[PDB]
Ligand binder design. Structure first.
Ligand SMILES: O[C@@H]1[C@@H](O)[C@H](O[C@@H]2[C@@H](O)[C@H](O[C@@H]3[C@@H](O)[C@H](O)OC[C@H]3O)OC[C@H]2O)OC[C@H]1O
Length: 395
């Protein structure tokens, strides 16, 4: 007998019940392979992973956003090439998802889900304030909605400021809308002014403009994602900029365990910006998966083949958690919120990975720091953009 160890960040009880049913089924079909799921909370996982990967405590598999840390971990010899065990994975999963985890002919991981960040909103609170959420197409319209919400005495936005990344979604999206894919491409290459360019300065300027409306909950800087999601679920804030995993999370974090119910819930894409080079269809999100740590056993790929299979992924789409990567599992996307989000992801010409993840722990950490820093007045838009660029050039 051998044990496959998979480290993950999932907290949802319905997701874990599905994962455990899949593991139980796999263990019956593979009597010599056991599966151990190892939970570590998102923030703790990101901070502790570097130590874990250099140690004897490392698992076979661990959750991954791809992006910058994945590239450096692969180059540093911290991952295991499973190309010789990837045939079924390649047959059952999206080609793009598989390619996100492949480098230099080496398959270092496999995809689990794709996601979109957008504005979840409360239709009940919007109606109270006089706002038609389906009519918010522009950033100026969004800001007008913020003012209306404030006028009605409703906290406009819930944000998990303590964790930083929930605020970075604003800076990132504004940069995307101002500059388009081309400004971002130049910035990654450090061409011209790079990340210190006009679109990134504009992003901070517009973030500062939002912040000046005081749209967040009191104490937002001490709030993590869980608190922010709870506030939205408890009808105490009208808007939550977040990935699509929030649907189930806001319900779990609500005191009533239901949150904003479907009749009261809306979702909108990030709006467009006047004079911007970006399109409203461009999406921020990503392709998340599981990476193989150096030393991973072949049985880990056998587990992954089954865990990421069509039937498995169909269940996870049916419980409204993920937009799947397994071929055919999109049949599980019956919920209209998730069905629409899946079409946006598919139609997106630019599908950008979360900036913090695209840039790696250091430079992404700077983006996270400057997002809350702009809001708090620590740095100006210009200083913020310059910091990102300088850290990126050194990387
Ligand atoms: O760097 C962030 C990255 O941390 C973020 O990761 C999300 C993750 O938050 C989400 O998990 C939720 C848990 O945090 C929570 O404790 O329980 C509910 C979970 O849904 O899973 C999706 C990941 O992508 O993504 C955005 C990056 O900028």
């Amino acid at each position: 007998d051998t044990t496959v160890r998979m480290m993950h960040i999932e907290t949802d009880p319905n997701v874990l019940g599905v994962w455990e049913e899949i593991a139980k089924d796999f263990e019956a079909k593979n009597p010599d392979i056991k599966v151990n799921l190892e939970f570590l909370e998102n923030e703790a996982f990101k901070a502790k992973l570097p130590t874990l990967l250099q140690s004897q405590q490392k698992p076979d598999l661990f959750y991954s956003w791809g992006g910058g840390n994945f590239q450096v971990r692969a180059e540093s010899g911290l991952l295991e090439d499973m190309e010789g065990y990837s045939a079924t994975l390649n047959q059952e999963l999206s080609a793009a998802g598989m390619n996100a985890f492949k480098i230099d002919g080496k398959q270092y991981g496999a995809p689990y889900m794709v996601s979109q960040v957008g504005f979840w909103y409360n239709k009940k609170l919007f109606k109270q304030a006089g706002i038609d959420g389906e009519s918010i197409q522009t950033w100026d319209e969004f800001l007008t909605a913020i003012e209306k919400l404030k006028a009605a005495g409703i906290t406009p936005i819930a944000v998990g400021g303590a964790d930083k990344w929930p605020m970075h979604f604003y800076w990132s999206y504004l940069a995307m809308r101002a500059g388009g894919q081309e400004a971002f491409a130049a910035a990654m290459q450090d061409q011209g002014d790079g990340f210190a360019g006009e679109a990134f300065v504009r992003a901070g300027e517009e973030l500062k403009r939002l912040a000046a409306l005081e749209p967040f909950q009191p104490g937002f800087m001490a709030a993590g994602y869980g608190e922010s999601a709870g506030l939205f679920g408890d009808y105490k804030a009208a808007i939550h900029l977040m990935g699509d995993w929030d649907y189930n999370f806001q319900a779990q974090q609500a005191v009533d365990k239901k949150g904003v119910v479907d009749s009261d819930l809306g979702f909108m894409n990030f709006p467009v910006l006047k004079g911007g080079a970006g399109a409203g269809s461009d999406t921020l999100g990503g392709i998340n998966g599981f990476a193989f740590a150096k030393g991973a056993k072949p049985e880990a790929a056998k587990w992954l083949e089954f865990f990421l299979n069509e039937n498995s992924q169909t269940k996870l789409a049916e419980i409204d958690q993920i937009i799947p990567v397994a071929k055919g599992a999109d049949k599980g996307l019956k919920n209209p919120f998730k069905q629409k989000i899946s079409q946006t992801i598919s139609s997106a010409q630019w599908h950008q990975v979360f900036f913090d993840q695209a840039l790696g722990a250091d430079v992404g950490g700077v983006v996270n720091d400057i997002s809350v820093g702009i809001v708090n007045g620590d740095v100006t838009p210009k200083e913020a953009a310059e910091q990102v660029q300088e850290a990126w050039e050194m990387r």
